[PDB]
């Protein structure tokens, strides 16, 4: 089921068997790379970049056409962000809830949900410190 | 001879009780409006969701947003239709309950309504009394 919820939701992406590039795809590996770079400069997230490239330009899977993933391409050049996507998003959700809580002292629900977010930050931070993508002195405030 | 004027419009108990059924959403909307000649009315309008003719499902409930949209719709209809005109015309509008019929027609698209009546009308504030207009109301 979920991390911090009783729901057993089964809703994710089902990537097809055929890894083969579609015959109708005109864009080449280098052309896609140039597109990813141009998108990345506008200040976007690998998630958003992948969605925009899937919707607009008709690239089913970047890793199939190029042979490398979005964060990996941006890492290889050096247009990758300092904090990983998911940790950054948890921190901005945490500070948003804390900003709400600072006015509302009675909102017990907000306090409970903050505790649940903080737990996700710490559990993800520990993993990133284990893989040595963050420094070992990295704390949360 | 005693000279009377409009003070409010009430709905009889047995009707109001006979309307409320156990398998449909009731929608209630109240609004404060100032008439042009200067009478302040509080109008309460009530509506009920319609069992369709070929409906097998037992319940005919409307979702919270659909209810809010209908409430906004009947509020703005009441506002518009009792803001522009005066008591002379507003009473004549309420005699056939034309407000209700117009809400029933307007709210059909969002969710079919069964019985939409102007439940209550209350006189909140009056102007400073003068005999001329009271006599004009009588002739």
């Amino acid at each position: 089921g979920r991390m911090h919820a009783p729901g057993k939701g089964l809703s994710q992406s089902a990537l097809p068997y055929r890894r083969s590039v579609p015959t109708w795809l005109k864009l080449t590996s280098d052309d896609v790379k140039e597109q990813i770079y141009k998108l990345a400069k506008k200040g976007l997230t690998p998630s958003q970049i992948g969605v925009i490239l899937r919707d607009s330009h008709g690239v089913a899977q970047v890793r199939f056409v190029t042979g490398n993933k979005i964060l990996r391409i941006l890492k290889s050049k050096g247009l990758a962000p300092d904090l990983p996507e998911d940790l950054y998003h948890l921190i901005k959700k945490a500070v948003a809830v804390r900003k709400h809580l600072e006015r509302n002292r009675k909102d017990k629900d907000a306090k409970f949900r903050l505790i649940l977010i903080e737990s996700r930050i710490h559990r993800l931070a520990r993993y990133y410190k284990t893989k040595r993508v963050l420094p070992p002195n990295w704390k949360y405030e | 001879n005693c000279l009377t004027n409009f003070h409010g419009m009430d709905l009889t108990r047995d009707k109001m009780c006979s309307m409320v059924k156990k398998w449909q959403t009731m929608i209630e909307a109240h609004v404060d409006v100032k008439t042009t000649d200067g009478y302040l009315l509080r109008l309460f309008c009530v509506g009920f969701t319609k069992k369709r003719n070929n409906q097998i499902r037992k319940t005919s409930y409307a979702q919270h947003q659909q209810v809010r949209q209908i409430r906004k719709k009947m509020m703005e209809i009441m506002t518009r239709e009792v803001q522009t005109n005066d008591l002379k015309e507003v009473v004549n509008k309420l005699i056939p309950d034309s407000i209700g019929k117009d809400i029933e027609k307007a709210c059909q698209s969002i969710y079919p309504l069964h019985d939409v009546f102007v439940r209550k009308v209350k006189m909140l504030k009056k102007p400073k009394f003068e005999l001329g207009k009271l006599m004009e109301l009588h002739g």
């Binding site: - | 108990r13 047995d14 009780c17 006979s18 156990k22």
Partner: protein
């Protein structure tokens, strides 16, 4: 032992249901459990309707009705004889009595 599967009430997938007052003896009972009796009775009984018809100034005047929803606690529901005990097999039958 477990007498009724539903625990003699309707609350399922829900924490706490607000209490109501028993129409007879004013006992505090949970709304879900309470025996509800919605009675639509004519304002005049058929025996007395004849005397109203002639006396009435209006012709073909449909008579009003009283709509009142009575809430009964189990103590009062059983004493008033609106509901009585059934067999262990006929309990599971939840069809209302036909009239």
């Amino acid at each position: 032992t477990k007498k009724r599967r539903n625990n003699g009430r309707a609350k399922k997938g829900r924490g706490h249901v607000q209490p109501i007052r028993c129409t007879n003896c004013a006992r505090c009972v949970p709304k879900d459990k309470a025996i509800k009796k919605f009675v639509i009775r004519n304002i005049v009984e058929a025996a007395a309707v004849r005397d109203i018809s002639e006396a009435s100034v209006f012709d073909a005047y449909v008579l009003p009705k009283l709509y009142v929803k009575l809430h009964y606690c189990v103590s009062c529901a059983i004493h008033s004889k609106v509901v009585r005990n059934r067999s262990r097999e006929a309990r599971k039958d939840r069809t209302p009595p036909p009239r």
